[PDB]
Amino acid sequence: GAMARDPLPFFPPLYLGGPEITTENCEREPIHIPGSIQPHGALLTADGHSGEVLQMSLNAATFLGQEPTVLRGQTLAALLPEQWPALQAALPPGCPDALQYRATLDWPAAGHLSLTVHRVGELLILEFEPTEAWDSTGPHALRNAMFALESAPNLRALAEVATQTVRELTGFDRVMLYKFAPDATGEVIAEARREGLHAFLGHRFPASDIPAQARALYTRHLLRLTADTRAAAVPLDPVLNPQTNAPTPLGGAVLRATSPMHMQYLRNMGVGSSLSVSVVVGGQLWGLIACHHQTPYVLPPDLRTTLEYLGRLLSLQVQVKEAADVAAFRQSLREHHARVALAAAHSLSPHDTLSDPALDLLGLMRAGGLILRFEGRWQTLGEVPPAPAVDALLAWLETQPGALVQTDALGQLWPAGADLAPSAAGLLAISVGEGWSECLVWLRPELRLEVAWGGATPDQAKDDLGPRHSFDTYLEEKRGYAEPWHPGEIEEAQDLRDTLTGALGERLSVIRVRNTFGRYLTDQVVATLLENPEGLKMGGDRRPITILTSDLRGFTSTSEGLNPEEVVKVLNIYFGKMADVITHHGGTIDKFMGDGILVLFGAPTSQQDDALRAVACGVEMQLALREVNQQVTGLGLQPLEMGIGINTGEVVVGNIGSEKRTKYGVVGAQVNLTYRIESYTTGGQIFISSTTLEAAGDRVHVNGNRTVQPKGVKDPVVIWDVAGVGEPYNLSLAV
Amino acid sequence: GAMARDPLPFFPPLYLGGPEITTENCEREPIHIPGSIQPHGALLTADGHSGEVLQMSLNAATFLGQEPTVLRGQTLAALLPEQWPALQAALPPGCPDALQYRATLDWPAAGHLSLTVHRVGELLILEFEPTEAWDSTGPHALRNAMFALESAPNLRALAEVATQTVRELTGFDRVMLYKFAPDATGEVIAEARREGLHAFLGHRFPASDIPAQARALYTRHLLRLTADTRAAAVPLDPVLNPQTNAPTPLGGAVLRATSPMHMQYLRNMGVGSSLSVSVVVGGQLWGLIACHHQTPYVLPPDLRTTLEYLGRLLSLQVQVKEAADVAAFRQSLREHHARVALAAAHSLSPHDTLSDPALDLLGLMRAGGLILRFEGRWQTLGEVPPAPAVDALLAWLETQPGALVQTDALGQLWPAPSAAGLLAISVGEGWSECLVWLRPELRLEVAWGGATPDQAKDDLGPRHSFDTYLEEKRGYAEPWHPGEIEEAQDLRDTLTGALGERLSVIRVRNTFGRYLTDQVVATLLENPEGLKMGGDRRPITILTSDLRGFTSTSEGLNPEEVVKVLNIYFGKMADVITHHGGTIDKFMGDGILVLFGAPTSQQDDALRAVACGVEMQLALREVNQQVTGLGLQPLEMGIGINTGEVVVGNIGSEKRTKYGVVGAQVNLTYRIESYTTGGQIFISSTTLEAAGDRVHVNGNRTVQPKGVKDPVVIWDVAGVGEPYNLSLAV
Ligand SMILES: *C/C=C1/C(=C/c2[nH]c(/C=C3[NH+]=C(/C=C4\NC(=O)C(C=C)=C4C)C(C)=C\3CCC(=O)O)c(CCC(=O)O)c2C)NC(=O)[C@H]1C
Ligand SMILES: *C/C=C1/C(=C/c2[nH]c(/C=C3[NH+]=C(/C=C4\NC(=O)C(C=C)=C4C)C(C)=C\3CCC(=O)O)c(CCC(=O)O)c2C)NC(=O)[C@H]1C
């Protein structure tokens, strides 16, 4: 950004053999050390401790009415017997160079003088200038303006009051408020002017009309002027400070000679006199009050002080009015902003929430297209570039520093993307966390706009070796720019980025609970578990739980002759319906081992009807397979068949994983027994153990039984064939 | 926070039957509508459209030089023939009541008068004051003050210039800068005064000395004065505005009579004249330039305007100076800040990064104790109260709103000793992950100007004593520096911004393998494509293990022995499997399933799987030392490995995916393991072929497990050669 770019190193001044200044090298003119002054005042420099005079402007003798011999090598003690002790008191040695001291002198000849002093290291710089010794303006003009500035209701009105007041105070033929853009171009956003004068209002001027080292200088010394655009500069004698054998810094002297480049610009523009006051906001040059007179004009010093004070006042009020205008913009989005904040705040699946048309993330930013990248997938709303180009933008976005990126001409910030101006000329992108792995990208189409320039566009700065001669309206078509993002839209995006980034709190814990307690647990069960962290006895515990295992009989063998995509599709269908059923019965899915399911009832938390719910779950799982086999045989494949075993008993519960990556699981002979029980089933059948049937109760309807001695058990056991469950399930296997 | 709390509703004023004002209700005094003015000026009110004069102060004739009947019911057009068109243009209908217009008048029997006008609703309010023949040589004192304030190096120095300059401009016997705290107590942070006056510098004063409705009014109308603290008010006549039959709002008139309660305070303090100017920063009352004279003093209006100018400049520079003071505090901490900023940004296990003493989160904030809650658990550095108080503090911090909680007296915020000061930041929203800085008690003595806030309602009028009253505060820590608040917010921003990076790795590990290395997770994220979630048939090598008979022996162990043994076993097996790039797929009871080929495949999948199996068997030697140390029997382990085409893809539901494998070659692996005995590794012929000549074998078996159409040869593995050089001990 040209405004946030320090000036180039300056070249040596002319009187040290520096180069001549043209529009090629003019950002390097050392305008702060011209070694000369404007002829309407006089300048002395003096040693800061002794007060010996070291330099005089060539006109100081004639100005201060003393022969040049006495003056040179006189002391300020003798030249200013009253003001010498005072400026020492006000400008103590070692004080900042910015500090200035002002006084009136009753001088022997031609009237009173205005004295302005400042210190630069070991050197005192004294400016002398005619004054009335009588404030022409009176007390009320400034006080009235200050209150009127503060009561202006918005930025535009504040600009009107500023230029209208300054022109009333000074009599200038033209007073402009000139506002710098981030690329250091500027625009006349208010103008008060004498009748019959050409209007510059609404015109943009190239950044080169005020070069970077002038803008830097104007950030530190807030007023400067050219009283007479025809007047020759007056040299300092000697031109170098003899304390240093180096140029005398003159940036803080209002009598500093103006650059010949700018002198010529003002003549071309028809200007006899010029003055500007910096508006500085947050340490940055926000703009200028820029004044012109058609004929030479020396603004009296007291009028200048009024201006300098208005400068300070305007610097604060520009900030106040800009914040109020932004807040008013956001005030009209309040209803919509709250609604978007509430949804984003607690949402655990951002993709389904932020793409809802009822949320209208597109309208919230007046965007033409929105990209949402969350988890691993990105979807879009509205007008976006073809899918190949969206992936190229997200790839370049990942390289951008920060968590917010904003531009109204994406083609310039990212060259390869200049082709995407029909839908992505402007872009506002925010990163949920750092790295752009999750982000939102509002896009805006190219908006062709005409720009009124003051005589020339920025690329015509070097057509001549000097300033241009025309400042009349020059229209240029703007290419590749979108409508700019309002500062309130920038803020809205910052608010929403913060909300989603905060929401990563839950999105990390619930995925961490599922890793420990159940990969397929419901968002309610996880919520239930987060509230009650204790009671779970991670270090180990033995207690009763019911275990259910199922397998698809021979599906692993029939899957060696299907498409790999058919297998995955069939397993996805099956597990989907199975998981819905098991969830409905409060079971914890513990493993999806191939085509087999293990379900726990009682871990992570138990209830008195664990066994009954497991049996009912088993029945409905079998019934659910009939719905599943419609799609499978719909796809052209053979029906699936399923056997289920259920056991109930004491198992060891706890962190059965490792220490660094825990898993709440169960271990013991009663787990293994469930598999042996399931191994006695055929398709459609459910075998349960005697402990399960006993624990489940009289609501379980059995078909018959078998005594079996599975390998792994010392004693024979009776297993029971389930036909159904009664109230309140009323679930029955078909026969 | 009494500063950001609106005033209470005022009570009706006395002349409408309201209650007498005492220290019981003085926050309800309607000080903006006294119906009266101070006697060094005169006041008219007129209709905003016709200019008809509606009220006059009772002294208006003496001031304006015309008896009341010629003034009353006359029109401002006739009375101010030049100023009437001007003040209408400056004060248009609807303008803010803050907006003021001033002019000078020259009248007979009246000298030069200052006329200050402003508009309240449909009413114009005109104030008349003696003023001076204009003779200034220019605003030199202002210009010099302006640059002196701008060059002040810090906030203390800025305050010193302001009071020094105001005293030089005015002659006031005492000039103070009075800075409000968030609780609306105030402190005199700079003072310029007569030598014979008792110093108030450094003293704090109760919030009630400037009540909430004075503070609110002082945020809109930036100057008020009491010219003579013994001068009697002058009634308005009539007292009520006839447009409304309601009181006339005088908040915006400098001549407004001062609250009687405050007049008595000034007298009790020995003050003869008073004036203060608001410092308003970001729309908030930051403080007052507060001035006392021991004798009466009517400041001419032109000199008040210079004070008003300095108030505006000082509102700007207080902002500039406080920021620079904070930036200078943090500049000392820069290298330390960068050091913590780097660590917290890229950490995927913040518990081990932040507890590092070389990171020095305690010293960064100059704290005595630090709590660190991340993921499931919490942990503490330095001096922390016990685990009940930490679990109770962490529970209560979930109560607090926002992401940052800052106090220097935790006993007051939360009733329930190493922690008198607390600074807490929420990583994300809700405090599920947070940092808590704790500071111990710092016995400080507050110097109060006469009395503590407890003694506000001791008598029905103001206090008489304003001498130093030292009060010992208990349960307090050294206050958090504003730079230390900014450092905590920065660190909170960083850790919260690192949640996205922490999120990407747990999402991937949740899909592709729970125990995956933080290194291979980075691999899957820079190359996310080609994984083929829809389905694919690829060769992979599969390794299954079991601890034979441990399921039975565990029925005789205490459950805590069972979990401890499995934790030791799995923890060692995981180390070995990860060293060999295996993907632990399931911890099935005491069994492990490991994939070599998923999610990614190298060309030596089979060899690594065989060598991993050998090392797991060897690693069981170091496990069986800890298991027998605990007094238990030693574990035995059998291993089977198979290599074959399997279906690879999303095997879970569509909603909760899991990258898994399915097929007969997966199931054959468990059958191959079932033939092993303790200490033995059986592998299939396809594994032996893919692994290559570096595998050392003992013998072989032809087996035909059911569910298999054709017999298969399995091979007993003795060890692995270069570069592994592992052999099963024999
Ligand atoms: C290659 C160098 C160039 C150059 C140099 C230059 N310009 C300035 C200072 C100013 N230029 C201003 C420009 C404007 N005045 C207007 O009235 C408008 C629009 C209506 C514009 C854009 C202004 C305002 C200033 C500030 C000075 C002032 O207030 O008069 C300097 C610095 C002068 C100095 O302080 O010594 C220099 C070196 N101007 C170019 O256009 C090219 C040729
Ligand atoms: C129960 C009511 C109380 C009360 C009322 C009250 N106080 C004010 C205004 C001011 N009080 C000030 C206090 C101080 N002056 C000092 O010099 C110091 C410290 C050294 C303090 C704390 C100040 C500065 C003001 C502003 C007025 C001024 O500049 O003199 C009002 C409002 C006055 C008005 O605008 O009419 C009221 C109602 N003060 C209490 O102490 C209790 C009794």
Author numbering:
A (entry chain B): -1 to 733
B (entry chain A): -1 to 414, 420 to 733
From the paper:
To improve our understanding of molecular concepts involved in red light regulation of enzymatic functionalities and to extend the optogenetic toolbox, we focused on an artificial system that links the photosensory domain of a red light–sensing bacteriophytochrome from Deinococcus radiodurans (DrBphP, (4)) to a guanylate cyclase (GC)4 domain from Synechocystis sp. (Cya2 (5)), resulting in a novel red light–controllable GC functionality. Because this cyclase's substrate preference can be easily switched by a single amino acid exchange in the active site, our efforts also provide complementary adenylate cyclase (AC) tools. The resulting constructs (phytochrome-activated guanylate cyclases (PagCs) or phytochrome-activated adenylate cyclases (PaaCs) for constructs based on the GCE488K substitution) sample different linker lengths and relative positions of the cyclase dimer with respect to the phytochrome over more than two full coiled-coil heptad repeats.
The best diffracting crystal was obtained from the ATP-specific variant, but also PagCΔC forms identical crystals under the same conditions. The structure of PaaCΔC consists of two chains in the asymmetric unit and shows a dimeric arrangement of the protein in its Pr state, indicated by the 15Z-conformation of the biliverdin chromophores and the typical β-hairpin structure of the PHY domains' tongue elements. As expected from the periodicity of hydrophobic residues in the linker element of the PagC fusion between the PHY domain and the CTE, the linker helices adopt a characteristic coiled-coil arrangement. This results in a tighter packing of the PHY domains and the presence of a stronger kink in the connecting helices between GAF and PHY domains when compared with currently available DrBphP PSM-only structures. Interestingly, residues at the C-terminal end of the linker helices of this light–activated construct are not in the coiled-coil register that would be expected based on CTE conformations of other class III cyclase structures. Although the overall cyclase dimer closely resembles those of other known cyclase structures as well as the isolated Cya2 structure, residues in the short CTE helices do not interact with residues from the other protomer as observed in all other CTE structures. They rather interact with the linker helix of the same protomer, thus “folding back” before proceeding to the cyclase core domain.
